[PDB]
């Protein structure tokens, strides 16, 4: 039974329930993420920005079944073109806007990567990506407003691949956290 999360903590409890089995209902997860209304007071603990690039801040480990984390994007910060290691990935905006660009999996030949589409994700919107759909890049193109987003990955993964736009070549990347449970990482 899907109910509206009243708070971030409530969202987390609902997610534990949803992920209690070994099979995940993606539509239900997206729906509950969208129904959570961003309340900056509830996630301030996790919103730790960096001057130079975006930060990843772990919120919950999902009793093993998922990682839930908050990403903080300064003006002009963006990500690489990346995959998600055969996991489910959900992204919800908690503050500001992000441009999401979708790319096709590259061919064998070196070649400018092909942009499928792009869209602006606005506050409280929740999107879904998985490798079968394609690859993506996420960016805060604003010059005046920092952005904050909530991400959920299941199963959790800490390694993925980044892709070069000019050539399609991929490189392995290990994901790092800037903070976990509100505490900065060494
Ligand atoms: Fe992503």
UniProtKB/Swiss-Prot annotation:
Any one cellular-component term (Gene Ontology): cytosol
Origin: domain of life: Eukaryota
InterPro entries for this protein: CDO_1 (IPR010300), RmlC-like_jellyroll (IPR014710), RmlC_Cupin_sf (IPR011051)
Swiss-Prot/TrEMBL cofactor(s): Fe cation; Ni(2+); Zn(2+)
One term of GO molecular function: zinc ion binding
Cofactor note: Binds 1 Fe cation per subunit. Ni(2+) and Zn(2+) can be used to a lesser extent.
Up-regulation conditions: By increase of sulfur amino acid intake.
Pfam families: CDO_I
Listed GO biological process terms: cysteine metabolic process; L-cysteine catabolic process; L-cysteine metabolic process; lactation; response to amino acid; response to azide; response to cAMP; response to ethanol
Enzyme class: oxidoreductase
Record Gene3D superfamilies: Jelly Rolls
Function: Catalyzes the oxidation of cysteine to cysteine sulfinic acid with addition of molecular dioxygen.
Subunit structure of this chain's protein: Monomer.
Family to which the UniProt record says this protein belongs: Belongs to the cysteine dioxygenase family.
Protein name: Cysteine dioxygenase type 1
Organism of this sequence: Rattus norvegicus (Rat)
Gene from which this protein is expressed: Cdo1
């Amino acid at each position: 039974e899907l109910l509206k999360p009243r708070t971030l903590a409530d969202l987390i409890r609902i997610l534990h329930e949803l992920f209690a089995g070994d099979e995940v209902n993606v539509e239900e997860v997206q729906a509950v993420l969208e129904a959570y209304e961003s309340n900056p007071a509830e996630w301030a603990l996790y919103a730790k920005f960096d001057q130079y690039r975006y930060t990843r801040n772990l919120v919950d480990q999902g009793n093993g079944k998922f990682n839930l984390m908050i990403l903080c994007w300064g003006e002009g910060h963006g990500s690489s073109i990346h995959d998600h290691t055969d996991s489910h990935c959900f992204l919800k905006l908690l503050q500001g806007n992000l441009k999401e660009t979708l790319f096709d999996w590259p061919d064998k030949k070196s070649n400018e990567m092909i942009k499928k589409s792009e869209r602006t994700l606005r506050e409280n919107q929740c999107a879904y990506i998985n490798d079968s759909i394609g690859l993506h890049r996420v960016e805060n193109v604003s010059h005046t407003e920092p952005a904050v987003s909530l991400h959920l990955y299941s199963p959790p993964f800490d390694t993925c691949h980044a892709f070069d736009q000019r050539t399609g070549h991929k490189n392995k990347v290990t994901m790092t956290f800037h903070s976990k449970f509100g505490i900065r990482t060494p």
